[PDB]
């Protein structure tokens, strides 16, 4: 639980808890027990829900794309990144380095644009450098060593656990550096993002009518370790492969410095 408030009385002494120096890089450790007179109160309040495991440990949408049954629009491809969607990006771009292993949950909803029999979906994950399919009868789809999930509709959503598959000791949300050694090529965190593409298709061979399925991937980080905290993002998220921004006001404005509602 959080710290209790000790009782204090009227003080007149040469000690000064309120007097500080911010220019020391030091945040004052004073309590309301140092400035004013306080009563003894027992704080049973805990900080259990502000921890990194409880904060980041909720499944956020990271990818939506359509793929149709009955060409290259017959299946989906994602080339995994957190940066597709803004709300989980701002939570992950809040720590510089963070080490977690995630389980992903797919929400696959087929919609008709004559009766669909039943739809079974395949979510094949190729690690980086593997063979990519260019067609639905690719030959790549047989998953000898690629992980893959087969899911028929009307069941629970497909949840599988993923380990910490990074090369480095932590995932890097930010990479202030270049791709090539001559300081050339791709700038930013794109260079570090080597996680394989994600391929989703209907294992149904065809359909009598045009059926368009959409997939929704929900990462939920667990076993989370985060290092070097940084301020949350202020300006919006124009790109996915770079932290580019239009300059925005730091805070909402007032009419005067004294003005208050």
């Amino acid at each position: 639980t959080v710290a209790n408030t000790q009782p204090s009385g009227p003080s007149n002494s040469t000690e000064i808890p309120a007097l500080t120096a911010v220019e020391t890089g030091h945040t004052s450790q004073v309590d309301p027990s140092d400035t004013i007179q306080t009563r003894h109160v027992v704080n049973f309040h805990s900080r259990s829900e502000s921890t990194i495991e409880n904060f980041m440990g909720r499944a956020a949408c990271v990818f939506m794309d359509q793929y149709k049954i009955n060409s290259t629009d017959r299946f989906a491809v994602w080339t995994i990144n957190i940066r597709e969607m803004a709300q989980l990006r701002r939570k992950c771009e809040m720590f510089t380095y963070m080490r977690f292993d995630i389980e992903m949950t797919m929400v696959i909803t087929s919609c008709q644009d004559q009766d669909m029999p039943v739809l079974t979906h395949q979510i094949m994950y190729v690690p980086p450098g593997g063979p990519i399919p260019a067609k639905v009868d690719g030959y790549e789809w047989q998953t000898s060593t690629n992980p893959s999930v087969f899911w028929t509709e009307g069941n629970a959503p497909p949840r599988i656990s993923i380990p910490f598959i990074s090369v480095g000791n932590a995932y890097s949300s930010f990479y202030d550096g270049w791709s090539h050694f001559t300081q050339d090529g791709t700038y930013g965190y794109t260079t570090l993002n080597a996680m394989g593409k994600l391929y989703i298709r209907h294992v149904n061979r065809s359909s009598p009518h045009q059926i368009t399925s959409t997939i929704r991937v929900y990462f939920k980080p667990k076993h989370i370790k985060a290092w070097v905290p940084r301020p949350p993002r202020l300006c919006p998220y124009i790109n996915k492969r770079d932290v580019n921004f239009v300059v925005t006001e730091i805070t909402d404005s007032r009419t005067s410095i004294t003005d208050t509602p």
Binding site: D31, T35, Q87, F95, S161, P231, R233, I250
Partner: protein, 238 residues
Amino acid sequence: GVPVLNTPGSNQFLTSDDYQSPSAMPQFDETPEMHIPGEVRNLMEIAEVDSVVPVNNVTGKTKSMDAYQIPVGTGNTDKTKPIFSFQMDPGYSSVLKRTLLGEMLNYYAHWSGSVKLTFLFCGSAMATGKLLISYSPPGASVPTSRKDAMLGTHIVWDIGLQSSCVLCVPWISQSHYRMVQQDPYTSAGYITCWYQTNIVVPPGAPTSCDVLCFASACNDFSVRLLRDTPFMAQPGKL
């Protein structure tokens, strides 16, 4: 086999659940753990760090540096007028909703504990002064005079070698938690600043100085109910 019974909540996907799931990559050898400096294990570690507060966020100064600095002068006029004044609730207040205290607070619905406001005086070494920074709990209007403001939890801050002062807002609340959003039932008080005496400056020093404000949480601060932040406001595909 063993007879089972499927209860409600089967075959659902609750986003905030704690279940075990089959690993996609069995017997995976993770990268060995290494010690990186500065591990954060709780978000109230990084809400208790100071952050400069844009108190002077008037129209035309927000997209600049003049939003952070509080104009404090030496004169005969307007010494019975507040230096600044703003809401004490760090979630919806248009001054400290963007601070590190307010950024980590907007992911939550409820908050408890004492916040403290640190004031760094950025004048010359020869310029001296005294200021009255006061907090008045709700129930009455904003203090309009220094007489009405010295009835709340205030501090008279002599400006000298230390050059910094902490006003600890002491968490005078009816309930154990307050709403981060603005509602009348749980609304924080008012933080006003006044001239205790004046700023006195020597003949050759610059007569217009400014106070720089800070805000952070105390050790008894806690947030309670997770929600999404309203700031990001994605418009569409990136």
